[PDB]
Design a protein around this ligand. Structure first.
Ligand code: NDP
Ligand code: ZN
Lengths: 146, 95, 83, 114, 206, 291, 134, 125
């Protein structure tokens, strides 16, 4: 029932500030002229981009590649992930290494203090699926939840 | 017997009148906006409720071969009433 | 000027990608300990070329094919890039 | 792959059968423009014609080429005669519709056109 | 039984036995004579033997089928030889019909029958207009139905309904000019193909 | 901008371009091709008419089912012209005539009426006020047809500043008043005329550009022909008042700095190329000077 | 403000936790003047002197084959390995896990229905909240 | 008689389809999904090859919806995936396949709803 949100408080045109100070409506060629001109001024490491939310991996690379030619690599995201050791490295630290289908092929789980029920509710169904049909026992840490 | 915009144009059954900043109103220039004043939502509340006997009945639209396929209703709600999606009639149980 | 990246393309199980798998268990931690804030990254497809990209400051990159290269030479192949 | 051939063998025999057709269209730009009046003088009509044969040079299959000769002969057989009109002969040119930007930057100021 | 279009079993055997009569007499280039429950005959063949079966059927006492009625071209854009080209004839003497269909790719031309049946002078040509299927030895092939500047072959299943052009009058040139296609209502492709096969023992296992 | 002015749509003829406009004099020669290059690409072009409904039928087409509307007015009436442009992103002024009437003169038509359209447009929240005076029209020209027009070029700016102005050179096209004049009957008269569409495209191209918000243009075209070489060339190809004939011999200019065409999105078509089609109705290469 | 489209309105490629990279075939075109995200950054480049070597959608995918070529294998999982290296690499790390109750932000049903810039902006979700808080 | 060749078998010249709808036109080959409302599954067993979508603007007069691409409502039913790519390559269109999604054969034992030991002991029969 989110599609209703896709037609409610949604952006349409390239807006930009007013000499007064507020926002108005312009064209793409009216706006991007204001941007690349500013991009050519501040470069190197006074520059950064925050992805997050609901984004491609097509724009991310181009957006990366764009700030890749301005010597600026401070590409960040909303929610943290640790980096003190092998953070982005070694693709077993930010994945479901376990096949989500393999959740059936498991007798034990340790849930750390998050809610499958509310974060990815449908990782919780394969739990409850494998809670009923095949035996399974779970143990949770922090935040007692229903 | 309709309600009207501050720009002065006629509203439909639905709130449909164009904003002020709209080039669409051109088509009404030297013409006029066709509209039906007979809002069903106004006519239908101007219809008395048929307070029948037994809790379940059939309804029709004035002629069994002539409208409103024979749907039924459970009139257990003494709080509200029961409607038929074809018509806009309403009913009670009398008890 | 500077390199500011290393990345690693390999295949999980194949003769061609061999040696990279040897390279990781044998040296990876120490380089990441020598190069802590250096943004490395390592990925393992199925039937890809065992390749190795590495950026520079102006998004400039190079490639070094390492098809059927053993661990000792891959390391020199990595340090010639960290030369 | 041991196909049935039609009207020719491997390409370089079909390439003269082509030229029998250019041998007609090259001499039937001036006859059309006069008999049924037009705007083009003679030349940009001939540029357009070769601009169609320098669209299909990418072909490499004799069967395809032995076919494309035919549809040219039909339009020729429709052009050599007056079965067409001043609107059909002058239809290829795309005179009126604005050619879209072949570049990227102007191509999406209008149109979600990848 | 009232509402089932009574089968009339007998003429199946006539068209079946006669269906055999044409096979063993002509085993070359002939594959799977058949017949539907509707007692109407079908004969699939190879394109290299088109005429010698027609001329048997135009010229033979036991197959006087000297009157042609159609020559269509049916699309199946999932096989190799997508274009099933169909014949269908008639006896004035024996009071029955037949169907003699073949196949082709987008380019495996078929020699024509106009020496046999001149009725096919134009039926052959629309297929050239409508599908782009060349024929050998056909007099004066050319377009029939399409404009004199219409590229394509529209009854192909690849060609969209509303095609690739729409015409109009651009007053600056005083002509009926063409520019690309720009609808106002957008024909609305429906998913009227329900589940539930509806026809078992009549179907496709995987 | 708002929600439906948006130019979302490819090509033309059922598209949209946010060029909702009000061309006034589009009933004769010039505006019909303007509406053609507007109405083709998708643009709700209004057309105010004050003439016969039959003299406007050829405008019904080149209009895609709603984008062409019509309505009545008269230039000697305040607030009707306002009513005509209460809904107008854009305004165009092509009005004009080659002869005075009992009712209207050169003075009343090119100057006083655009003055009210000018004020009328500003009383609404319009953007553009494309006007058409004519080249060769500073002031003190040998005729009167042009000396009035330049006042409108003065009197608009004191009403609606930042208004495009096109003062083009002489126009030729089919059903003109210029080539057909010569066809149906001299040095020191030299003139570089301009094909119609090459004027029309720019106007259509000028009602979308970010620039051209007050810059006075002048569409001239190539091949500055000499009259005596040209008038015989017509005779070589084919085989009335004071202020018009006085306007013929006035025709002399050179471009000082003015923008022209190619800085608008146009490739100007010369005369010789599309010259037969118009003279084809009279059936059975001329010398240029730059100066 | 550069209006970009949404997942219903672009040919993009997202990925799941598993790494099973997948695709968003498009349904609708976005409203008004908005365009696709990556389709902009190609322009923001070229309006400047910068110029990426892209002119389509496939070039952008061919880029992905150069960065981390998991983002093209649709419905498949880049079957991974080599966790112990992280543990060795991470065991040398040493930090403090302070004494609080670790708790998530999602704790009940009412803090579910409103998240990340879409569900916030719809009545149909707040009807649940407006119903569940009663 | 016959002739040998091994080539890509292009046809793109024999259709019109001038320039836009040849190159910049992806194609999706798939087995359509089970309309989860209905438990019926005959819409599978086939290899529909619908094409991408483009602008559908709103006709400013009527409120109608209109388009530019006639090549949008272009279903095509095939019988095997190996034949589909051969058909689209034969016209040069950049196919983009999705594979079948076979459902598993699952064990569903009615009695196991009624276990003594186990945890599937249903309620409400
Ligand atoms: N055509 C040419 O040779 C050239 C013309 N121009 C300028 O181009 C513009 C177009 O004129 P053009 O279209 O060529 O000639 P038209 O004869 O087509 O006259 C143009 C329009 O002006 C309208 N008009 C004139 N007077 C009035 C009035 N008093 N009230 C209302 N409408 C009026 C006419 O209405 P009706 O339809 O009733 O006549 C006509 O439609 C003029 O400004 C002209 O000076 C400049 C250079 C060359
Ligand atoms: Zn009722």
């Amino acid at each position: 029932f989110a599609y209703d949100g896709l037609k409610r408080q949604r952006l349409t045109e390239p807006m930009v500030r007013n000499e007064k100070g507020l926002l108005t409506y312009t064209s793409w060629e009216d706006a991007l002229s204001r941007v690349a001109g500013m991009l050519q001024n501040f470069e190197g490491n006074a520059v950064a981009a925050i992805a997050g939310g609901l984004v491609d991996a097509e724009a991310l690379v181009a957006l990366k590649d764009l700030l890749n030619k301005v010597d600026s690599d401070n590409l960040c995201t909303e929610e943290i992930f640790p980096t003190e050791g092998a953070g982005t490295d070694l693709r077993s630290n930010y994945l479901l290494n376990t096949t989500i289908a393999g959740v059936e092929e498991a007798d034990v789980v340790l849930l750390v203090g998050t809610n499958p029920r509310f974060e990815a509710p449908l990782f919780n169904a394969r739990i409850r699926k494998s809670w009923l049909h095949n035996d399974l026992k779970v143990a949770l840490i922090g935040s007692p939840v229903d | 017997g309709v309600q009207v915009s501050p720009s002065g144009e006629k509203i439909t059954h639905t709130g449909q009148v164009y904003d002020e900043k709209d080039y669409r109103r051109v088509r009404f220039v030297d013409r006029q906006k066709e509209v039906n004043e007979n809002f069903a939502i106004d006519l239908i509340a101007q219809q008395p409720v048929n307070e029948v006997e037994h809790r379940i009945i059939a309804c029709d639209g004035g002629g069994g071969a002539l409208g409103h396929p024979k749907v039924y209703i459970n009139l257990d709600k003494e709080t509200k009433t029961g409607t038929c999606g074809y018509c806009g009639l309403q009913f009670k149980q009398h008890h | 000027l500077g390199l500011r990246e290393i990345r690693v393309h390999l295949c999980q199980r194949s003769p061609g990608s061999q040696g990279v798998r040897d390279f990781i268990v044998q040296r990876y931690v120490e380089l990441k300990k020598a190069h802590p804030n250096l943004p490395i990254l390592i990925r393992e497809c199925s039937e890809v070329q065992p390749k190795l990209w590495a950026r520079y400051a102006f998004g400039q990159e190079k490639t070094v094919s390492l098809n059927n290269l053993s661990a000792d030479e891959v390391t020199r192949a990595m340090q010639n890039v960290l030369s | 792959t041991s196909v049935k051939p039609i009207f020719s063998r491997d390409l370089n025999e079909a390439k003269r059968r082509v030229r029998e057709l250019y041998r007609a269209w090259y001499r039937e730009v001036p006859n059309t423009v006069h008999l049924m009046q037009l705007d083009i003088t003679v030349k940009q009509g001939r540029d357009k014609v070769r601009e169609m044969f320098m669209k299909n040079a990418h072909v490499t299959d004799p069967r395809v080429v032995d076919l494309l000769v035919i549809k040219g002969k039909m339009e020729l057989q429709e052009t050599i005669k007056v079965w067409k009109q001043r609107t059909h002969v002058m239809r290829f040119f795309h005179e009126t519709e604005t050619p879209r930007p072949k570049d990227f930057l102007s191509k999406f100021y209008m149109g979600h056109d990848p | 039984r009232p509402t089932v279009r009574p089968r009339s079993d007998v003429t199946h055997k006539q068209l079946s036995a006669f269906g055999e009569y044409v096979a063993e007499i002509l085993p070359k280039y002939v594959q799977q004579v058949q017949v539907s429950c509707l007692d109407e005959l079908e004969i699939c063949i190879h394109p290299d033997g088109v005429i010698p079966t027609l001329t048997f059927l135009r010229d033979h006492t036991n197959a006087q089928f000297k009157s042609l009625a159609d020559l269509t071209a049916v699309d199946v854009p999932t096989r190799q030889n997508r274009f099933e080209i169909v014949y269908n004839l008639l006896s004035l003497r024996f009071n029955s019909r037949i169907r003699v269909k073949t196949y082709a790719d987008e380019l495996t031309p078929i020699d024509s029958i106009v020496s046999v049946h001149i009725a096919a002078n134009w039926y052959e040509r629309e297929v050239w207009d409508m599908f782009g299927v060349f024929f050998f030895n056909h007099p004066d092939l050319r377009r029939i139905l399409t404009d004199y500047g219409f590229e394509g072959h529209p009854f192909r299943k690849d060609f969209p309904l509303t095609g690739y052009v729409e015409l109009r009058y651009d007053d600056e040139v005083k002509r009926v000019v063409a520019e690309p296609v720009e609808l106002a209502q957008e024909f609305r492709k429906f998913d009227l193909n329900s589940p539930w096969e509806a026809f078992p023992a009549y179907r496709q296992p995987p | 901008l708002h929600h439906a002015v948006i130019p979302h749509g490819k090509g033309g003829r059922s598209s949209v371009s946010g060029v909702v406009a009000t061309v006034f004099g589009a009933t004769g020669f010039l505006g019909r091709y303007v509406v053609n290059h507007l109405g083709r690409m998708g643009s709700q072009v209004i057309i105010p008419y004050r003439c016969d409904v039959y003299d406007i039928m050829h405008l019904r087409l080149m209009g895609d089912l709603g984008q062409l509307t019509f309505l009545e007015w008269d230039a000697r009436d305040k607030d009707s012209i306002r009513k005509a442009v209460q809904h107008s992103n854009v305004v165009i002024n092509l009005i004009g005539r080659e002869w005075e009437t009992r009712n209207f003169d050169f003075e009343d038509v090119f100057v006083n009426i655009p003055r009210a359209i000018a004020q009328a447009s500003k009383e609404a929240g319009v953007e553009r006020f494309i006007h058409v005076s004519h080249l060769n029209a500073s002031m003190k020209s040998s005729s009167k047809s042009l000396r009035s027009k330049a006042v409108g070029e003065k009197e608009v700016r004191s009403v609606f500043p930042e208004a495009i102005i096109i003062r083009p050179s002489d126009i030729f096209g089919r059903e003109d008043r210029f080539l057909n004049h010569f066809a149906n009957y001299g040095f020191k008269t030299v003139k570089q005329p301009v094909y119609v569409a090459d004027v029309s495209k720019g106007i259509v191209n000028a009602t979308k550009d970010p620039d051209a918000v007050g810059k006075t243009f002048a569409f001239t075209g190539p091949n500055r022909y000499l009259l005596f070489h040209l008038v015989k060339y017509i005779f070589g190809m084919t085989h009335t008042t004071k202020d018009k004939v006085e306007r013929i011999h006035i025709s002399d200019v050179m471009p000082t700095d003015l923008p022209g065409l190619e800085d608008l999105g146009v490739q100007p078509t010369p005369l010789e190329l599309k010259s037969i089609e118009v003279l084809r109705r009279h059936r059975t290469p001329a010398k240029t000077v730059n100066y | 403000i550069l209006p970009g489209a949404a997942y219903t309105e672009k040919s993009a490629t997202y990925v799941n936790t598993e790494g099973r990279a997948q695709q968003t075939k498009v349904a609708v075109t976005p409203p008004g003047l908005a365009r696709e995200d990556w389709k902009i950054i190609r322009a923001l480049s070229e309006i400047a002197g910068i110029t990426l070597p892209y002119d389509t959608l496939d070039q952008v995918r061919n880029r992905l084959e150069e960065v981390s070529p998991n983002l093209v294998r649709y419905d498949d999982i880049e079957e991974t390995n080599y966790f112990q290296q992280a543990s060795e690499l991470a065991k040398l790390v040493n930090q403090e896990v302070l004494a609080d109750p670790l708790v998530p932000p999602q704790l009940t049903i009412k803090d579910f229905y409103m998240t990340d810039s879409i569900s916030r902006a719809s009545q149909t979700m707040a009807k649940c909240v407006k119903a569940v808080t009663e | 008689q016959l002739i040998t060749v091994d080539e890509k078998l292009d046809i793109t010249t024999l259709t019109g389809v001038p320039e836009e709808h040849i190159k910049t036109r992806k194609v999706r080959i798939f087995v359509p999904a089970r309309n989860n409302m209905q438990s019926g599954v005959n819409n599978t067993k086939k290899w529909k090859m619908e094409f991408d979508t483009r602008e559908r603007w709103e006709n400013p007069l009527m409120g109608w919806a209109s388009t530019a691409d006639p090549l949008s409502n272009m279903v095509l039913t095939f019988s095997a995936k190996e034949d589909a790519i051969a058909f689209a390559e034969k016209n040069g269109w950049s196919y983009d396949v999705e594979e079948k999604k076979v459902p598993k054969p699952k064990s569903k034992s009615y009695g196991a709803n009624f276990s003594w030991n186990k945890r599937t002991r249903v309620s409400t029969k």
